[PDB]
Amino acid sequence: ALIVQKFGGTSVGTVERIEQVAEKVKKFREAGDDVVVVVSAMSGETNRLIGLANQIMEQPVPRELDVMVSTGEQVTIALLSMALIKRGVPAVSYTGNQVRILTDSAHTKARILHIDDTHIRADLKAGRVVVVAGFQGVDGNGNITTLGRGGSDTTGVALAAALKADECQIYTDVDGVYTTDPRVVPQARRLDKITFEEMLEMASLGSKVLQIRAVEFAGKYNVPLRVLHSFQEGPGTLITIDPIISGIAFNRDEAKLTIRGVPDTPGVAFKILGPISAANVEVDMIVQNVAHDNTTDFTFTVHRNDYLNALEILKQTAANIGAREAIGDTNIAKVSIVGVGMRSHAGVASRMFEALAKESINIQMISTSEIKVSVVIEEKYLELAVRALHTAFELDA
Amino acid sequence: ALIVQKFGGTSVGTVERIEQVAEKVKKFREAGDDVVVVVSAMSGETNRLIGLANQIMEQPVPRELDVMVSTGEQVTIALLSMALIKRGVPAVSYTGNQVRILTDSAHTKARILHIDDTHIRADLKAGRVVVVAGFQGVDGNGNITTLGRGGSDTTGVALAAALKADECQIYTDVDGVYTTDPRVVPQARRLDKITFEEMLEMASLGSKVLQIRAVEFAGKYNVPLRVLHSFQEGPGTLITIDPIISGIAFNRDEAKLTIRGVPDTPGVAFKILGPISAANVEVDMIVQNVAHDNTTDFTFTVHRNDYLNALEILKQTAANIGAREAIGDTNIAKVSIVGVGMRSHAGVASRMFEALAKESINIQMISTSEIKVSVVIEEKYLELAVRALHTAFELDA
Amino acid sequence: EQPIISGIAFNRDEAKLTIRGVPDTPGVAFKILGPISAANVEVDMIVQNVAHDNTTDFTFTVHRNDYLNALEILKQTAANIGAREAIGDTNIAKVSIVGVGMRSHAGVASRMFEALAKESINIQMISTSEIKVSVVIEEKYLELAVRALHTAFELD
Amino acid sequence: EQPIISGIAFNRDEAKLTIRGVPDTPGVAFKILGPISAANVEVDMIVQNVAHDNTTDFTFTVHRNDYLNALEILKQTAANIGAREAIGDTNIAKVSIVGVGMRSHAGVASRMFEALAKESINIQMISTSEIKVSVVIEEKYLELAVRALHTAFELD
């Protein structure tokens, strides 16, 4: 089997760290696995080089910035090849341009267009470990490019798709993706497998370490993704596609906006949300129930930072379209159960509502998906709701 | 016209320093000059990268070492491109692979085989300044290579030859190449022009600053070479092809070996020097005068570090070929006059011997070239001989 | 005609149930859906907007085969808890934009509502998820709505 | 023929002059070459090896047109300063390897002496410069010597 492994800046932050990465990679190769390793620049180099450029200009030239920042990964790919060769395991380093990770022309934010499997496949069949520079490529004209944040993660997943790897392993600080935030529920436990769809629905698990885009890419190409702690304490979590509920997700940074008595006619929903979109306000939830006497209510949710901007915009719309009023509330939290199998089982929503009612928590809003039920409650109840649902659905440990 | 400029590590040591070179380049470009600039890594970067590799291994893998050290120049080319753009002069950086500097495979010591002029010529005709990373290229298989010490000097001259540039400018600390070493003769003068042949003949004027190989290369392809102080205090010196004597050269690190009473038969000269060459002793001077009674003497000169090795090898030979003795002397100095036009005029050697005779200096050995006379004298007289000749030839000027 | 999405999905086998004027107090959502679940009727969509003057409306969807059953349980619950009425509809379709992207809900939803609006398709219900925006419309307009959405967006 | 050099040069217009047993004391090279220079005779090669028993030999070369003039001046100087004799030769040629590389005199010279020794060409004089190794041989052997050097070396 073929495996793609990606190592973050911390993992390769020092020579001592790189030597350790090599030792592990040695173990996989020793097991009969062909290995492709994706590495990032050692810690501080990417920020240090960017800082060197901003030292030169306030808005540094995107095309030239790419050739500066891209060098960091090139130092790293060589050291790990050396630390591997020293350990008796053959390795070859690859530049972005050497493999041929063909990309966009958007300079500090380039997107992968095509990856040549021919040169790497030959190195793998010759028994060598391929060490690829993460976060780089070149456009159709030969100009160097950088992917953007999470670029290395993207590269690893893109290599996994083009090479049709068995799985792509992302090494990081966390031991996996958990049933819920362990800071909130100490009995939260590590998950063995979840679908791409479940992982995306539990957004807050999405963070700085694993970029959301990476989860998105692997899903498009059915790339088995494993998240593990760098030192293999455990198997990690396998995110692939195929326990009544997988997990509990929540968001405390929410504010709700409702426009009441809206005329129930085509185009009105566009009038409500259109101007919000024009202002670049992120919208999370949108809820509209059935009209009565040709009027309805329309509610959506935004981050607290943008609450008043969205509210003043909505008040304008309520004046424009003749609605009864526009009102908002920032004292809310969103709590969700996600899991496949919700689709095949009756009563999952019943059990969630019962568990909230046992705790005297009033449900203000309900929104849904095939694999998700979301509830909006008063912010004070957030941790209690999360714990109530967590024992109720038997995820406790 | 087209000018190629090379700036070393000290010249691009800091961002502040890089900014000035850009100003320097700006002036030329504004004058109607197409400019190609080759730059080195920022100060300490090349050594910092190597030491990072020795950290990994005692003998770091040559092919992978090339991938790491080459990154230093790649940072520098972008910064100077950015520093040029800010100033309002368009620039594009070129990695070695981009221009296409094709090379050899000797990884830490690669030699340039071919340079593509097409892409650079295009950027120049578009009116941009092309900044090329010195000291790197790629072999026929796509592997990154580094030129070795003095690589950037080599790169600039190679670009000058492949582009048929009008001249190649090497920027460094010295003001030019002098009549003689100023430490010895404070009245030494900066030279306007000397031939490649004179410059090579004055070997000690070639420091780490100007690699001798770089001068050799320029000579084979008639690349006019100028050496200047980085801040254009003056015209520098021009070395190209084409004053009674140009300069005075000397070497204190010498030792003479003589084998006396050698049989004057074909093949004996091979017997004397063959084994010296086998031991890798570098030899400077070789002097043999006409035989008398079918025997002659054979003398050569070596660096003091190799003296005892050479002497003991010679004694053995003297024994083998039946010579009368082999003798050595470490208490010698070599002083030379070099100048074109020596070929043209009579009595130049007379004037050199007279000046040494005015000073009571005994001449022990004489060796010659069309443009050079070399003398070997007692070591104590080195500075006096150089001064006497420097005034005799009116170089004080 | 440029925005990016994974696909457009729809379901013609859906029936809408609404219980209106339900008291806005804890335990009610369970009283409504508890007996539906006890009968083993599967539930797909559930929509509840904010309460006004201490009552709210609660809507859910079921497979068409369970409509009449769910309707009668809901009607009996409506009388038990003092709700105003229980109403049902079978002539609806659910159409969704999938693979939306979390930060982009305001963009794709704006385009979807716009596309529907060009044709005169009135939207009766809206629900959201991290990766989906879903709409409920009268069933007869499905084909026009899907064609409008295919023109409005770019499939990935 | 592995070694690289720039080329093979030779000069057929040369005449050798040697004054033997000259006292090894300062000013003597000027006394020998002073009058030659006074006659305006140009000099090319000058070769002097180390003194032994307070005398040395001193050889130089001039254009063939000037041999007879140089020979007599040297003969008078030889008588003036007490040298043993002054002798001349016209039947000689100068052959040189150019483009040597200062680093490689030992290697190129070993190869040049070997190629000449494989033919039976006796080397009578050897002189050196930073970028050149020079040999003097009987003129009749010039063609054979040049071909041998070409065979033994690789040119640029």
Ligand SMILES: N[C@@H](CCCC[NH3+])C(=O)O
């Ligand atoms: N049928 C629900 C389960 C809970 C419903 C309770 N009536 C679902 O699949 O989400």
Ligand SMILES: N[C@@H](CCCC[NH3+])C(=O)O
């Ligand atoms: N041609 C000069 C120099 C000859 C010695 C070096 N080739 C002279 O006759 O003085």
Ligand SMILES: C[C@@H](O)[C@H](N)C(=O)O
């Ligand atoms: C003395 C030595 O030079 C000899 N004549 C030779 O030709 O090798």
Ligand SMILES: C[C@@H](O)[C@H](N)C(=O)O
């Ligand atoms: C309205 C209904 O949802 C009620 N708030 C509940 O908590 O069940």
Ligand SMILES: C[C@@H](O)[C@H](N)C(=O)O
């Ligand atoms: C209420 C609003 O959604 C309207 N029905 C529309 O179709 O836009």
Ligand SMILES: C[C@@H](O)[C@H](N)C(=O)O
């Ligand atoms: C012999 C000659 O070289 C003499 N020694 C001189 O010094 O002029």
